[PDB]
Symmetry: D2
Amino acid sequence: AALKDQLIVNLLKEQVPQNKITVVGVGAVGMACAISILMKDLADELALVDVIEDKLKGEMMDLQHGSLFLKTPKIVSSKDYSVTANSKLVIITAGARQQEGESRLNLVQRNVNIFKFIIPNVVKYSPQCKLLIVSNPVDILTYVAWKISGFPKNRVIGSGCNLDSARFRYLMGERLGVHPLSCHGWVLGEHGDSSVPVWSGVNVAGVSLKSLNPQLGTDADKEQWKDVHKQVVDSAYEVIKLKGYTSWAIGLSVADLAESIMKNLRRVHPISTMIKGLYGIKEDVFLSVPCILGQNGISDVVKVTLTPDEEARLKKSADTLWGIQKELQF
Amino acid sequence: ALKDQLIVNLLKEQVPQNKITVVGVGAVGMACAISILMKDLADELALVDVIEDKLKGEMMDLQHGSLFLKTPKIVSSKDYSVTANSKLVIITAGARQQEGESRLNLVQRNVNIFKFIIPNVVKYSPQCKLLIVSNPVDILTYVAWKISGFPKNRVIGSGCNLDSARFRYLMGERLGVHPLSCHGWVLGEHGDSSVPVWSGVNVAGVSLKSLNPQLGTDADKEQWKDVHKQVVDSAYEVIKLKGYTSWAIGLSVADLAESIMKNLRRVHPISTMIKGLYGIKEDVFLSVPCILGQNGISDVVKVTLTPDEEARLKKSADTLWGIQKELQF
Amino acid sequence: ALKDQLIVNLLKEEQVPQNKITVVGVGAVGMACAISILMKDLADELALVDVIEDKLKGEMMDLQHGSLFLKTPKIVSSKDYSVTANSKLVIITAGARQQEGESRLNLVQRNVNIFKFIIPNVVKYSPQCKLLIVSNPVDILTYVAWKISGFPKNRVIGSGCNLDSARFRYLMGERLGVHPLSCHGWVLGEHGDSSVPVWSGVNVAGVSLKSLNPQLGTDADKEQWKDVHKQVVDSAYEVIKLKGYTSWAIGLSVADLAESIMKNLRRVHPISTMIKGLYGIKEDVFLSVPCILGQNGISDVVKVTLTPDEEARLKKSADTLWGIQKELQF
Amino acid sequence: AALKDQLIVNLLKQVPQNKITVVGVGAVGMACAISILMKDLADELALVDVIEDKLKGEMMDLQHGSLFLKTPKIVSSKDYSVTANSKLVIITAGARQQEGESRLNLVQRNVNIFKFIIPNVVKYSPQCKLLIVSNPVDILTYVAWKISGFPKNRVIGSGCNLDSARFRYLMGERLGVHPLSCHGWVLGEHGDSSVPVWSGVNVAGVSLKSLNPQLGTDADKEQWKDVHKQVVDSAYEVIKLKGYTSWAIGLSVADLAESIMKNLRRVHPISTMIKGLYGIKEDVFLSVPCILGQNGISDVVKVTLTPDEEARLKKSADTLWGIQKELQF
Ligand SMILES: Cc1nc2ccc(NC(=O)CCNC(N)=O)cc2s1
Ligand SMILES: Cc1nc2ccc(NC(=O)CCNC(N)=O)cc2s1
Ligand SMILES: Cc1nc2ccc(NC(=O)CCNC(N)=O)cc2s1
Ligand SMILES: Cc1nc2ccc(NC(=O)CCNC(N)=O)cc2s1
């Protein structure tokens, strides 16, 4: 004799990947997570899983053809979860996706049923992975993945408000003429309509915007900054109306989370976690609070000093999620 | 105002220094955009299309990921004034080939689209290089060249950069070597008449043809010609499976944009005018290894081809020249 | 010729680089700036300038030998400033450096004299460049470069407290078990002993560390956070005692500033600029305040809300610097 | 309570996954450290040396740069317990060549130092690959392999990775092509007896020797042998000018660290056992093109050398064995 044997002397046979990531779901969200992770050099092996065989194969092939331009030496796919074995991180993006003029909460029951199949299969092949839930409604689906998986809470992470906070910092950046990296502010709670802008922590160079505008984010705000949060809430609905779905910003947000996990950064992110007994909540609700994310998932939660209104809004967000959650079948 | 209480303006201002425009927000256009953004090649990105909603939606979706990027300005419009001061304009607009349809069948539809696009792009960007991605790429690079009236160094077709990348990936798979360490060139038409240059196929300077002179021929026990057949069929296989191709071409285009933006002077198999080489006496555009930098193609590598490889290259040139003779400007 | 047998030339190009960076001084600081800039792909051309011919050629050849692993296609050097022609950014690291125990202010006259030769030469070949001053005392030498160059203030930037602040965030990160990227705090004023930690702006996820500890950074602080600022001030002296100089952290700090300029990022950095008009400063004092940094240099200044003690400390830093800069011989 | 506990609720009661250790904090060691840090290859970086102050100072200077990096833990100690669980251990410690001194002259000093270093590395990092940088690299890779008890694939010498990068840079400068697009292999000893493989020197698959048969001989009108002479002389000239070399070796080591950490299976000219190849009968380690990945060197490419190139390679092996056979450890 063979040309390979005439060219190369083999001295060694077949080891497990060391930094493998799996993306479940090859829809627009899943492929944007896949491309973003590949372009960030986070994995030595990427595995893709879906139920639509041709689509899955074509997407994997399209990725593989770009191998020369990447540093991920193994791109694999299958409808069979055996392909996901030895993953450090498993990203779930599968299910019904948010529709034009409809809440993400409208996808709940269908995605719970789909997770009843996915989660045990993922768990069977990578019992020590970190689960990263992207599918909507993300906060409810994270709690669901947590209950089905049997994993300790640190290993079940929801993409949550990482994107809402990025959109908020972009918008704040545009108003101020400052790069989003230099605009600080957190959007917590539900990754959806009941999200909470923490105006009290919004700052540039440590300068509290609330200190220069006491009314910041209220109805009395002469600059109507609440409209920036309105823009955050509405963003997915506007993007879906224009292009039919959202993909790029979420793919970049998920890769940002994957980077913190894969490289054990211990950076703080506003991501879905169990808040039972934290803030003002007594229900087994998952929602975004600032978390320290690293190699073991969520190891710590930052306790944000919320104003009485911010606390009320966060309790309201938890209630809206518990309200939907309590009535589900699983 | 809150901005004035927080920030003192000290300076009243300037032209983008490393601007890139992507024409077409279809799957190819959007994969080029995400790839370019994730490689930090531009200080400004402009998007152009004819479908207003889709264009705004794509622009907004990219803008929302700005925190995770290093491209501080992302803009879009149907109006080409948005593309002003681009150093590189990437054209991905036009009809795409169906299963069983040759890229050469897209000619009349895409030339008519280029008749509008090309004069509008060149208008606002004196310093731009035109990078053609739309198909048939070789023919459309000649069309972009004729319409723009640009010098040949400035008009580039993505050509066989992806064909050679695919060939390199497939060779790597057979050998258990990364594509980076698998060398091989696929030249000519980015289509059915492409030419695998078996004479230059190597690992660590070792010629695979020197080890097997039957390499790439029907006599080949390992049927290495099937690797070139797979390169030829690749777009069609992917189209049949997922409906279109996007990721690999996006990465191939960002690779070329990187060499241009960073004046790397790397060698790529890309569409250029070959009048004067291999006995070609006409204004044919096709892929040959080109040195690519800040002024586009400044130099062309003269690949030494065996008589059969040269014959296959002239056959690809005749095929492309025949289609050029059908062009109605 | 072999080159011509292998290659057909199409045109004689205008070889003028688009993103050229010059590093003046090939000492330990200059070379650390050089390697960090090459490893960040910020430049299409890197030029080195020094007065020691052998060391200059040696440093240039060594960086050139690594070209295969880089994306900076031209690395050049000369004692002649003609080699610096058409630079977008010129980083000055040349001059005397602190000996063990030596104040950065002690380098003032020697460095002002060196700058009298350097600055006109830089200006001669790159009249549109942004000047980035790293040589010490940085604040005073930024004033010197400004006066000599005749450039508008936006294009004359001092590395200032970019590193002091990075050290502060690192130390804060170590105390809290959080990545420095998620620890926020600003060290302002002189890049030296009179620097000011802004305790009011020190936070993790927008939670003011002082709101949890009212006595944060004071003598009454049970946890003695003031020692974090003392460690910041002492850092270079401690590193100098141990390794004889500092290099890596300043190199990374300078490339961070180079990145904001070259890529027009408009990020906020605590760097040396004229503060005439802020905190009751009526003179041409250059010192670190948070600045928006982009392609045109310092376009804007963030007005930080200082406590009366913080403002008094900043005005003391301002007076220490003005005492020296007002009497300079040039 | 404490401020930390007022700010943070701990919910989880710490072993690195991609740790790298650099042994020796001289100019080579620190160039390796910064290059690795800037390539984001490790989640933990450990430094080891015998000079306490110097080690502490270097560690501290790296830590102070943590904000600009993605390596969340930088540690150091004289004690090898600090290197626990490394996936890669880079050895740069030992005597370095003076002006006018061969790397081969450092052998006794460096073999004696390796007797202490190698068993302490292996004791705390049983899963690691050993990357030898200290000189003479080829002999020290053999020595580290023998001492360690590690299989030969896990004991790699930086070898000719830098010699080949130097050759590719010089070739690029002569041709006006980026080194990435200039292919050429310098094999054998990382020293005076290195072998430029002229037969494999090519641009885009075009052999330079096919265009110029005299390539690399004294008859060559363009004197391309001066390129290999500059490669051989490079460390001596740089040492004569600046007192040592650091930047190019640092980047060459980070290149090898990348292929290892990311299991790339790229081809590099690095130190491995050549017994059984080109009729070499002894346990000589020298550079040949190797496939490098997560398990180190898994495969060796068999370069087809001309009679003179093969004679030069066997002469390099003979030189190395001349020094190696007289070693006591
Ligand atoms: C039992 C099941 N397992 C899977 C696995 C993947 C997918 N794939 C998608 O749903 C992709 C499209 N969806 C979005 N939102 O992008 C569906 C199912 S159903
Ligand atoms: C006169 C015209 N100007 C344009 C500009 C953009 C587009 N856009 C596309 O064709 C995108 C979809 N096509 C592919 N190949 O992705 C069409 C036209 S028609
Ligand atoms: C008139 C003069 N022009 C120059 C230019 C460069 C240098 N080079 C250094 O000072 C390097 C060493 N110094 C530090 N601080 O690294 C000195 C002079 S004197
Ligand atoms: C028993 C011993 N263990 C060590 C460990 C480190 C070092 N450090 C250096 O040798 C660094 C300087 N040398 C070069 N070549 O850079 C020496 C020794 S001696």
